[PDB]
Amino acid sequence: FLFGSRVMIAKEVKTSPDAKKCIAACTGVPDDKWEQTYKKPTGGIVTVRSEMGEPIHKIATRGVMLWKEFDETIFNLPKNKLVPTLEAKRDYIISRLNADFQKPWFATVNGQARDLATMTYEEVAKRLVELMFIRSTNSWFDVTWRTFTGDFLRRVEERFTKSKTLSLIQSYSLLDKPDEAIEKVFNAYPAAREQFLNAQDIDHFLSMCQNPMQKPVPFVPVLDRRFEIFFKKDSLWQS
Amino acid sequence: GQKGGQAIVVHPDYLYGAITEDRYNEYVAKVSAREKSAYKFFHNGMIY
Amino acid sequence: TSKDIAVLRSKEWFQLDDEDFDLLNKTLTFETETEVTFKNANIFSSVKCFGPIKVELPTKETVEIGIVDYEAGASHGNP
Amino acid sequence: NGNSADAAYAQVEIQPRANIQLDFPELKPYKQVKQIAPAELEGLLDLERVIVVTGFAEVGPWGSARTRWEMEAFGEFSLEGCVEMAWIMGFISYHNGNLKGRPYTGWVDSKTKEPVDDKDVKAKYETSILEHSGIRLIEPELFNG
């Protein structure tokens, strides 16, 4: 015999206290009432399609219930009808993502929602930090993220400057105290505290959000024909 | 055809003195937004 | 040339019995031996490089002039 | 020591990048202006009957109004006007996505598609532009023979 799900509540494992707490508080269901997961929470648990459509058992949390919802509305739904229905439900789906999901909408501010190009370089960074960084550890969950951020600031300075000069970021390690690494710049080019982004500084941000060999982003930057990928990728460790 | 012509011009800032503060700084913000939204368009379009 | 004999005399392991020597149109030969103590597969910990320095004569019968004595630590190569 | 440790001393030096602007006026506080003009102006004008300009643009042999200004006052271009006056001559283009498989996201040639930066532009195009911009010897193909 073997025991997969009987273990994840143990102490030696890395799951977080509250995660163990929920996976405990969820009551199971016998085999007789097993396959009801395709429709409802059966004891606090459900099945969900993957990006490959294949199903997956998962606890019935607000975020994975939202996943379920989008799976019967959005990805079930094909290519062409996808972009426009997103254009429509935008105001709603992002409110959700920011309320009841783990990879939120990037383009939000003090709860105020918006899109990328409505967001300033300064807000961009103050949110990149807010997510890719940990005030508790005062560290970075990873470095492809910190690397991301530095490579962003680099062309920030490329943009607002006039002629060549030396990066205020010569090593991304300077980010290990971020909130200063920004003012060190947004005092060099205060214009960005006000200006929105050039889109040439959006396509970049995104081509980077799609960087192989890097850890995907803990948020959503955009809605496009790739929402599912940005939505249900590397969506396991967070617990 | 002799249809000559003479237009002239003044500096805007000789205008805002015709009005009240609260209305000016109210106008002000309502513009800044524009410049940005305009900045955006100009570039989204300039590219594509 | 003469700017080369200087970068040479610029050196600390390029010592001779008499710097007076004339080093133009001369041909030199370096029969050096190296010793080294490591601390990693690449990062050395001690480096000796010794050996004579010889000179061509109009006969080309080489002869000894000076000595190399290079000492170093924490190197990553042999200069 | 190895450049292993000295590589970091090969400092990173950022080329600038073109951030066109709209040339909106500047707005100074109510002080600088309620002062520059008479205080007697307040409540003294029917604005509905006052006229104003709100926008403007242009086309010519020096492209738009943003760049002509440059050759009008400064006699020569910035890069903010050396690319704009290149985007509108079919010298360069855009591209985001992938080329060489690599994701390029920026300016590029339009006959070769070989990527480019807004720095190697001026040295690369500033010449032909000025040979093909402003007053000139008339070029037939703009006038169908």
Ligand SMILES: Cc1cc2nc3c(=O)[nH]c(=O)nc-3n(C[C@H](O)[C@H](O)[C@H](O)COP(=O)(O)O)c2cc1C
């Ligand atoms: C968190 C988790 C991760 C799993 N990962 C894999 C996997 O990577 N590959 C695989 O073949 N099965 C995987 N499984 C399936 C397990 O091998 C096993 O079938 C399952 O845990 C049994 O469920 P049960 O605890 O209700 O008996 C995983 C199961 C769980 C619960």
